[PDB]
Amino acid sequence: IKTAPVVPPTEQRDMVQEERVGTPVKNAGNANPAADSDNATEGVV
Amino acid sequence: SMLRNWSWVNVHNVHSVTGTSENVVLAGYVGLSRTHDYIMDTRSTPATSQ
């Protein structure tokens, strides 16, 4: 048995951190966001 | 006085009392557990009455 001094549970707080490597684009779920333009065969106002 | 103590014998007739050899490499006493327990006053003296 080894009794060791630890940090009291009430003087620390677990905080969830979300780590990201880059900011997702506007049309993140779209494989081809350029197909709204390539399929505008009548024009756009 | 050394020939009289059978220093002339064939060293292959001298047998260990167990008949075996041995290569011991055991993890041993370091003393970190006992010094830790002394500072915490948990088990200051580890020597028992026996």
Side-chain angles (χ1 to χ4, degrees), chain B residues 18 20-27:
Chain B
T18 58
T20 76
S21 307
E22 182 66 26
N23 283 340
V24 183
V25 189
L26 285 182

Short mmCIF file of all heavy atoms in Angstrom, two decimals, chain B residues 18 20-27:
data_model
loop_
_atom_site.label_atom_id
_atom_site.label_comp_id
_atom_site.label_asym_id
_atom_site.label_seq_id
_atom_site.Cartn_x
_atom_site.Cartn_y
_atom_site.Cartn_z
N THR B 18 23.47 -28.86 -4.01
CA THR B 18 22.18 -29.04 -4.67
C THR B 18 22.28 -29.79 -5.98
O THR B 18 21.26 -30.22 -6.51
CB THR B 18 21.52 -27.68 -4.90
OG1 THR B 18 22.39 -26.85 -5.69
CG2 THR B 18 21.24 -26.99 -3.60
N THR B 20 23.03 -28.38 -8.70
CA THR B 20 22.62 -27.43 -9.71
C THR B 20 23.45 -26.16 -9.61
O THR B 20 24.02 -25.84 -8.57
CB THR B 20 21.14 -27.04 -9.58
OG1 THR B 20 20.98 -26.14 -8.49
CG2 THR B 20 20.28 -28.26 -9.34
N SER B 21 23.51 -25.44 -10.72
CA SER B 21 24.05 -24.09 -10.77
C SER B 21 22.89 -23.11 -10.80
O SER B 21 21.73 -23.49 -10.64
CB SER B 21 24.97 -23.92 -11.98
OG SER B 21 25.95 -24.93 -12.02
N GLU B 22 23.19 -21.84 -11.01
CA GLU B 22 22.20 -20.81 -10.76
C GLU B 22 22.71 -19.49 -11.33
O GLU B 22 23.88 -19.16 -11.17
CB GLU B 22 21.96 -20.66 -9.26
CG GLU B 22 20.92 -19.66 -8.88
CD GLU B 22 19.55 -20.04 -9.34
OE1 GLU B 22 19.32 -21.25 -9.50
OE2 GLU B 22 18.70 -19.15 -9.55
N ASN B 23 21.83 -18.75 -11.99
CA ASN B 23 22.12 -17.39 -12.41
C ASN B 23 20.95 -16.53 -11.97
O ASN B 23 19.88 -16.57 -12.57
CB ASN B 23 22.33 -17.29 -13.92
CG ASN B 23 23.68 -17.80 -14.34
OD1 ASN B 23 24.60 -17.87 -13.53
ND2 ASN B 23 23.82 -18.16 -15.61
N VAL B 24 21.15 -15.76 -10.91
CA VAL B 24 20.10 -14.97 -10.28
C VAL B 24 20.24 -13.54 -10.74
O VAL B 24 21.33 -12.95 -10.64
CB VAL B 24 20.18 -15.07 -8.75
CG1 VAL B 24 19.05 -14.31 -8.12
CG2 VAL B 24 20.10 -16.48 -8.31
N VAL B 25 19.16 -12.97 -11.26
CA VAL B 25 19.06 -11.55 -11.52
C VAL B 25 17.69 -11.14 -11.00
O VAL B 25 16.68 -11.28 -11.70
CB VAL B 25 19.21 -11.20 -13.00
CG1 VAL B 25 19.30 -9.71 -13.17
CG2 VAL B 25 20.43 -11.85 -13.59
N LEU B 26 17.65 -10.64 -9.77
CA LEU B 26 16.40 -10.33 -9.08
C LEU B 26 16.26 -8.83 -8.88
O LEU B 26 17.23 -8.15 -8.52
CB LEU B 26 16.35 -11.03 -7.73
CG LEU B 26 16.08 -12.53 -7.71
CD1 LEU B 26 16.02 -13.02 -6.29
CD2 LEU B 26 14.80 -12.85 -8.44
N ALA B 27 15.06 -8.32 -9.12
CA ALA B 27 14.76 -6.94 -8.77
C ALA B 27 14.82 -6.79 -7.26
O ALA B 27 14.15 -7.52 -6.53
CB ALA B 27 13.38 -6.54 -9.30
#
